[PDB]
Design a protein around this ligand. Structure first.
Ligand SMILES: O=C(CCc1ccccc1NC(=O)c1cccc(C(F)(F)F)c1)NO
Ligand SMILES: [K+]
Ligand SMILES: [K+]
Ligand SMILES: [Zn+2]
Length: 364
């Protein structure tokens, strides 16, 4: 009944070493620790994922190339482009060890769930939902989300993946697009140009997995109240229809007000309400991070979200800790929405929601 918190020092230091997002793993843990929240959770050291574990989703040719690049680095290896490495996914040294750490942590979280050690397991350094079996994508080198769902499938016949990152959870969806055993649900920005340009509402899945993919395309400037209306509308239908035995929950904090992505206008209370709704099902629940590029706001969010998993209520004033200065000028936990318009027209949202109601009527 106490949640598992997947953490070691060596795990956090490796997750700090991915550029374009420096010292973020550390900032999140540092703030969670400063609120004394680790004292109410079970700290479990992540194992490193083996080649075989990693190969349950990914092709060996990809993993082997990823291993080579990690020792050397892009020069003397023009084969990189084939496997998704490039500017978006730098082919820098040490990444196969990061890949393995991340996949291992999500897998370790899933095993804690299977063993009955907990109802909730947390790996905030995970959530790398874009990676394909044989291709890096959107800064994701390894699909830990997929590796965890597959581990969960040993104990739990039906699994629900709910992806609340700003981006469409395309890699996870694609992995399970042809099966009814895993339902993927995704709320995301979907607009011409925006990555990855998939996950329109009409993306419903294929073959035996038709209607077992669900996608909510949302436009910029959505705030807490409206997002939760959309989210619990979709999730109420999904619970009754699909009836999941277990939940994998990606809570990417690039939807938050103040993020470089500057698309959605959410606060961690808005997401927290979506998280409470999934928690009240009292199912085995694997919690994952993901995108989150205003590093302080991301820690504010994921720290707040940990509090709600615990049922605790945190103080507004940020505790003094290693990265205290990053939380200025106000030094508070709460995030204020930007003053931008909400481009989601109500009629367009309602016809999206009714379409999903209708697709979920088919689920047996
Ligand atoms: O949000 C993501 C992946 C991120 C991504 C996908 C496709 C194209 C670009 C990105 N991310 C960035 O460009 C990015 C992320 C963090 C910081 C910056 C920077 F340029 F501001 F540094 C840029 N997954 O949920
Ligand atoms: K999403
Ligand atoms: K599916
Ligand atoms: Zn994202």
């Amino acid at each position: 009944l106490v949640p598992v918190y997947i953490y070691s020092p060596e795990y956090v230091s490796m997750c700090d070493s991915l550029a374009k997002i420096p010292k973020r793993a550390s900032m999140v843990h540092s703030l969670i620790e400063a609120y004394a929240l680790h004292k109410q959770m079970r700290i479990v050291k992540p194992k490193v994922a083996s080649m075989e574990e990693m190969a349950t989703f990914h092709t060996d040719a990809y993993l082997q190339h990823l291993q080579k690049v990690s020792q050397e680095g892009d020069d003397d290896h023009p084969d990189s482009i084939e496997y998704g490495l490039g500017y978006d996914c730098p082919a820098t040294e040490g990444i196969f060890d990061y890949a393995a750490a991340i996949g291992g942590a999500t897998i370790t979280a899933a095993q804690c769930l299977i063993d009955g050690m907990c109802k909730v397991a947390i790996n905030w350094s995970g959530g790398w939902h874009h990676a394909k079996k044989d291709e890096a994508s959107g800064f994701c080198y390894l699909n830990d989300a997929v590796l965890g769902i597959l581990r969960l499938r040993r104990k739990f016949e039906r699994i629900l993946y709910v992806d609340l990152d700003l981006h469409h959870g395309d890699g996870v969806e694609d992995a399970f697009s042809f099966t009814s055993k895993v339902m993927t649900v995704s709320l995301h920005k979907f607009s011409p140009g925006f990555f990855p340009g998939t996950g329109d509402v009409s993306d419903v899945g294929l073959g035996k997995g038709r209607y077992y993919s669900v996608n909510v395309p949302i436009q910029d400037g959505i705030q807490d109240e409206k997002y939760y209306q959309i989210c619990e509308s979709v999730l109420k239908e999904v619970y009754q229809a699909f009836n999941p035995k277990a939940v994998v929950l990606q809570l990417g904090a690039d939807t938050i007000a103040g993020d470089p992505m500057c698309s959605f206008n959410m606060t961690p209370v808005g997401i927290g309400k979506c998280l409470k709704y999934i928690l009240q099902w009292q199912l085995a629940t694997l919690i994952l991070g993901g995108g989150g590029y205003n590093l302080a706001n991301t820690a504010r969010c994921w720290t707040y979200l940990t509090g709600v998993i615990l049922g605790k209520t945190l103080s507004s004033e940020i505790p003094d800790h290693e990265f205290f200065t990053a939380y200025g000028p106000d030094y508070v936990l709460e995030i204020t929405p930007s003053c931008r318009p909400d481009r989601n027209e109500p009629h367009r949202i309602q016809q999206i929601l009714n379409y999903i109601k209708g697709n979920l009527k088919h689920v047996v």
